[PDB]
Structures are given as C-alpha cells and as structure tokens.
C-alpha cells in the first residue's frame with residue numbers, strides 16, 4: 140500500500156476512513172474481519188507484551204539474575220521494547236496481509252544483532268511464542284456475545300495467518 | 314507492617330513470617346491471594362480505567378476528567394493507589410489503614426477537584442471484579458486447588474468500603 | 481532506530497464526536513470508522529521496567545490464561 | 551487522613567521455595583520452608599509516567615476492544 144508506504148518507512152501519520160476505507164476492505168481478504176483481528180491484538184498490546192516477557196522470566200528466572208540478560212532496568216526496558224516492536228510489526232503484517240515490511244524492516248539482520256549482543260535465543264523464542272499464543276487467542280476469541288466486541292463468526296483463517304507471521308519471527312531470530 | 318505505612322522496607326520471612334501466619338486467618342492462602350492481585354496490578358488498573366472510559370467515552374473528550382496525559386496519569390495513579398491500599402488491607406486482615414490513610418478525606422478532595430463519582434464507582438467495581446476473580450481464580454493454576462472464597466469475600470468487602478467512601 | 485508501526489482502529493459508529501480527520505464521505509457506516517497508521521519510536525522508561533520487574537519477580541503468579549511452566 | 555502524598559504500600563510476595571538464589575533479606579531463621587519465602591512491604595510514591603498514559607490513551611481511544619475477561 141503506497142499510502143501506507145511512506146508511513147512504515149517521517150513523523151506524520153496516515154488516516155484511512157470513508158470511501159477509501161470502503162475500498163481498502165474490498166482489496167484485502169476479509170476486510171471487516173481483519174480489522175477486528177488487528178484491533179483486538181493492538182488494543183491488548185500491553186498485556187500481551189507484559190505477559191510474554193513475564194512468562195519467559197518465570198520459566199527461566201536466571202534471566203533476571205545478576206548475570207541474566209534482563210538484569211537491570213535498562214536491559215528489561217529494552218527487552219520489553221523489543222517485544223512491543225515485534226508485536227507491532229506482526230500487527231502491521233496482519234493489517235497489510237503480507238510479511239514484506241515485517242521481514243524487511245524488522246527481522247532482517249535481527250539474528251546477527253542478537254548474536255552480537257548475547258541476547259539469548261531461547262528466551263526470545265519463548266517470548267515470541269507466548270505473544271503468538273496470546274494473539275491467536277484474541278483473534279479466535281471464543282467468548283460470549285455480551286463479552287465479545289465483534290459479531291460472532293469464524294476467524295480461524297486470520298488466526299492461522301497471524302500465527303504464520305509469528306513463525307517468520309521465530310524462524311528468523313533463533 | 315505498620316512502620317511502613319507510617320521510609321525503609323519491611324522484610325518478613327523465616328520465623329517472622331512463620332509467626333505472622335499464625336496470627337492471621339488462613340496465612341498461606343492469604344499470601345497467595347495477595348500475590349495474585351499484586352502480581353496482576355498493572356492489568357487490573359488499566360483494564361478498570363479503560364473499562365470506565367469505554368462505558369463513558371466523554372471522559373477523554375475535551376470536557377472529561379481523563380483528558381490530557383496529566384489527568385489520565387493521575388487517574389491511573391489513583392486507581393493503583395486504591396488497589397494497593399486494598400491489597401494491604403488483605404495482607405493485614407483489616408481495613409483500618411485503608412480507611413485512615415486512603416479514604417478518610419478522599420471524597421471531599423474529589424469533590425473540590427471535580428473527579429466524577431460515577432466514573433470512580435465503575436473503576437473500583439472493575440478492580441473489585443478483577444481481584445475477586447484472581448482470588449477465586451475464575452493446570453493453568455499456580456497454587457494448589459482448593460477453596461479461597463472466604464478471602465475473596467474479604468477483599469470484596471474492602472473494595473465495598475472504597476465504594477461507600479467515595480460515592 | 482527503534483521505530484514500529486502504531487495502528488489505531490476507531491470503530492466509532494454512532495459516536496456523537498463528529499469526524500474531521502478525513503471528511504472523504506462515502507454514504508455508509510464507513511463514514512464513522514477509521515484505521516489510523518503511524519510510525520513512532522517505541523520506548524519503555526526504566527521506571528516502567530522497574531514496575532514490571534516488581535510484578536515479575538515473585539516468579540509464581542500469572543493471568544487467568546496460559547499453562548504453568550514456571 | 552489521606553495526605554495527598556500519593557504514597558501507597560507496595561507489596562511483593564516471594565514464594566521462592568527450592569530457589570537456588572539464597573535468602574538474605576530476612577534475619578530470623580525458622581528451620582522450615584518459611585526460610586525460603588518472604589513478604590516485602592514498602593511505602594512508595596505511586597507515579598504513572600505521562601509516557602505511559604500517552605501509550606495508554608492509544609489503546610483506550612478505540613472505544614471498542616478489551617481483554618478476554620469482562621462484559622461489554
């Protein structure tokens with residue numbers, strides 16, 4: 140998307156509504172469903188990132204031991220930041236319907252960067268995996284209608300699609 | 314735990330923790346209940362404030378009391394402050410510190426500032442619903458399974474004191 | 481550079497707040513909805529990381545969801 | 551009285567039985583597993599960074615979505 144091109148590459152935003160929004164949904168697969176799916180991931184972004192870094196850590200507490208890679212506020216903040224970055228790029232892949240920007244602007248060189256820093260591959264794999272599980276659950280949300288923010292239907296295709304994007308992350312950075 | 318609320322942290326383990334749990338109702342379950350609330354405090358606070366707002370979107374309109382980051386931060390801060398005094402009331406098994414250091418004088422303060430009572434009511438009610446669900450937990454469980462409904466009603470009551478105090 | 485897409489999805493059908501960020505009308509309920517897409521720096525203050533550490537350091541508790549693997 | 555200080559009790563519960571990092575913060579042995587568990591309590595000023603509130607407004611302003619739990 141060229142309107143979204145310059146975006147995911149200054150500071151000024153981009154706003155898609157009205158007739159353009161109607162046509163955007165005609166050009167992407169399952170436009171209405173896809174926006175619901177994106178909205179539920181990004182509106183829960185904080186709990187997804189927080190729960191994944193926390194779970195990575197409770198499985199391996201040495202990560203915040205004096206020798207662990209998440210020790211000190213600076214390192215923890217950077218790990219939380221990276222988790223959020225990854226989730227945001229995955230969320231854009233779901234919005235766009237492809238992994239072009241994800242691979243080119245987020246995953247490229249990421250494994251060599253983590254190698255050089257000694258950011259541990261197994262913790263990163265757990266962190267992303269948890270974010271994957273959170274995101275699939277939010278897209279496949281199987282709750283009541285008085286507790287579901289969207290019309291009830293079937294989104295297994297979109298869930299499979301976002302799971303594929305998370306797989307691209309884990310395959311690239313480990 | 315009273316030197317704290319009135320600047321050095323209190324560390325209660327070993328024999329001191331053993332005696333604490335003999336001096337309070339259901340000491341082991343009480344500390345699990347506190348653990349499950351406090352370890353989830355960020356999500357509880359933000360979900361309750363977000364829920365207060367999605368029910369009433371004008372709270373972040375230019376006329377609303379959560380508009381601007383200064384106010385939103387103050388609101389998130391207050392909900393956390395309230396949640397923490399409740400968690401301390403559950404830790405200590407009574408509401409005296411809660412009433413004295415948190416609620417005594419809060420309603421008059423909110424009145425002068427224009428902090429809306431109805432929004433505060435919803436925020437507290439959501440934090441209560443959250444906390445009750447973590448104490449009752451409502452595989453996938455960190456504690457041994459059993460009955461924590463007594464502690465859940467206790468913490469429910471401390472929220473109800475907040476609700477009574479600032480409505 | 482630590483930037484990432486920041487997506488906002490406004491499904492504001494029936495909202496009394498008048499839209500004014502596009503105004504390119506369409507004659508349907510698509511006139512009360514908007515996808516906002518920006519690119520912004522991702523930041524985590526060391527104060528927020530200190531708060532999350534205090535929430536993680538118990539090593540025991542979690543949300544409703546997910547299996548235990550502590 | 552509520553003293554406008556914004557200070558509140560910050561509680562950390564450590565059930566760290568079997569943990570290879572040794573206890574050292576409490577100073578009264580009981581010869582039970584209580585020696586490997588601790589309740590920490592401080593009185594800290596609660597502050598929410600205007601950065602966080604800003605990031606929080608972006609999650610909230612959609613007015614539609616939520617967590618799994620909760621009625622709409």
Ligand SMILES: *C(=C)C1=C(C)C(=O)N/C1=C\c1[nH]c(/C=C2\N=C(C[C@H]3NC(=O)C(C=C)=C3C)C(C)=C2CCC(=O)O)c(CCC(=O)O)c1C
Nearest residue numbers: 156370371373374490492495497499500501502512513514
């Ligand atoms: C309905 C819900 C609302 C009630 C009731 C209420 O009191 N306020 C409501 C909404 C609300 N909107 C904003 C700010 C923005 N909303 C948008 C999105 C829309 N712009 C459009 O053009 C369309 C239709 C195509 C929309 C839908 C935008 C872009 C903003 C500005 C900020 C942003 O997030 O980009 C607020 C916040 C304060 C305000 O500006 O009114 C509120 C409370």
Ligand SMILES: *C(=C)C1=C(C)C(=O)N/C1=C\c1[nH]c(/C=C2\N=C(C[C@H]3NC(=O)C(C=C)=C3C)C(C)=C2CCC(=O)O)c(CCC(=O)O)c1C
Nearest residue numbers: 200201203204326564566569571573574575576586587588
């Ligand atoms: C086991 C779990 C751990 C493994 C394995 C590992 O690699 N690190 C583990 C734990 C861990 N603990 C801390 C720090 C603190 N732990 C306590 C609690 C205990 N201290 C005690 O005296 C007793 C009982 C009497 C305990 C139970 C406290 C108070 C701290 C200090 C930090 C705080 O939040 O107050 C860490 C962090 C790094 C370190 O200090 O070792 C880790 C990783």
Ligand SMILES: *C(=C)C1=C(C)[C@@H](Cc2[nH]c(/C=C3N=C(/C=C4\NC(=O)[C@H](C)[C@H]4[C@@H](*)C)C(C)=C\3CCC(=O)O)c(CCC(=O)O)c2C)NC1=O
Nearest residue numbers: 186194197272273276540542543545546548549550617618
């Ligand atoms: C440490 C003690 C520890 C954890 C922390 C926790 C980590 C963990 N979390 C999941 C799965 C999910 N987490 C989700 C998150 C949320 N659900 C909500 O309702 C809110 C808004 C949000 C933030 C808390 C979700 C949706 C899931 C998926 C559902 C599910 O039950 O699986 C897992 C499991 C991941 C996987 O299956 O691979 C883990 C490990 N667990 C800990 O032990």
Ligand SMILES: *C(=C)C1=C(C)[C@@H](Cc2[nH]c(/C=C3N=C(/C=C4\NC(=O)[C@H](C)[C@H]4[C@@H](*)C)C(C)=C\3CCC(=O)O)c(CCC(=O)O)c2C)NC1=O
Nearest residue numbers: 356360363364367442443446543544616617619620621622
């Ligand atoms: C606006 C669209 C909107 C909300 C935001 C949301 C607010 C809301 N939340 C509840 C109930 C709960 N929320 C909980 C929170 C969490 N659960 C988790 O797993 C994580 C860690 C944490 C943060 C998201 C919990 C535990 C509950 C209660 C459990 C349950 O409901 O089964 C409510 C319900 C309040 C009530 O019952 O009065 C509300 C309104 N809802 C929105 O509509």
Ligand SMILES: *[C@@H](C)[C@H]1/C(=C/C2=NC(=C\c3[nH]c(C[C@H]4NC(=O)C(C=C)=C4C)c(C)c3CCC(=O)O)/C(CCC(=O)O)=C2C)NC(=O)[C@@H]1C
Nearest residue numbers: 171172174175176278280289290291292293294491513514
């Ligand atoms: C999977 C993600 C979900 C689910 C989603 C469904 N949504 C359906 C319809 C639908 N959703 C919207 C909102 C959407 N369109 C937008 O433009 C924006 C914001 C910019 C959003 C958030 C609309 C408008 C519609 C159309 C009908 C309506 O007006 O309500 C839907 C129906 C089937 C289909 O459209 O193919 C589904 C299934 N359902 C689920 O069960 C999971 C959780």
Ligand SMILES: *[C@@H](C)[C@H]1/C(=C/C2=NC(=C\c3[nH]c(C[C@H]4NC(=O)C(C=C)=C4C)c(C)c3CCC(=O)O)/C(CCC(=O)O)=C2C)NC(=O)[C@@H]1C
Nearest residue numbers: 341342344345346449450456457458459460461565587588
């Ligand atoms: C409601 C809160 C829960 C639930 C909890 C239960 N916990 C039980 C026992 C238990 N818990 C601990 C840990 C606790 N004691 C401490 O000192 C500290 C930290 C300082 C903590 C976190 C212990 C040690 C025990 C005793 C058993 C053991 O040695 O493991 C428990 C058993 C019943 C009882 O002891 O009366 C329960 C039910 N269970 C639930 O299903 C909800 C969600």
Ligand SMILES: *[C@H](C)[C@H]1/C(=C/C2=NC(=C\c3[nH]c(C[C@H]4NC(=O)C(C=C)=C4C)c(C)c3CCC(=O)O)/C(CCC(=O)O)=C2C)NC(=O)[C@@H]1C
Nearest residue numbers: 208209214217218221222224244245258262263266481482
């Ligand atoms: C958390 C889940 C991890 C973890 C992460 C850490 N990453 C650290 C530094 C770091 N991360 C990146 C990649 C990030 N920047 C980007 O621009 C993008 C994509 C567009 C991403 C994904 C870079 C470039 C760097 C280095 C420079 C910087 O700090 O900005 C980091 C700090 C390491 C250190 O201080 O030595 C950590 C801790 N660490 C973990 O243990 C888990 C697995």
Ligand SMILES: *[C@H](C)[C@H]1/C(=C/C2=NC(=C\c3[nH]c(C[C@H]4NC(=O)C(C=C)=C4C)c(C)c3CCC(=O)O)/C(CCC(=O)O)=C2C)NC(=O)[C@@H]1C
Nearest residue numbers: 378379384387388391394415428432433436552554555556
């Ligand atoms: C969020 C759920 C509310 C909301 C809250 C706001 N509170 C604001 C200011 C404020 N709050 C307190 C009470 C707080 N300070 C304490 O020391 C204690 C407990 C010991 C508590 C609970 C005070 C004293 C103040 C004023 C001084 C200060 O801000 O530190 C506030 C700011 C108002 C303003 O300045 O415009 C807000 C927005 N607002 C809402 O809409 C919901 C219902």
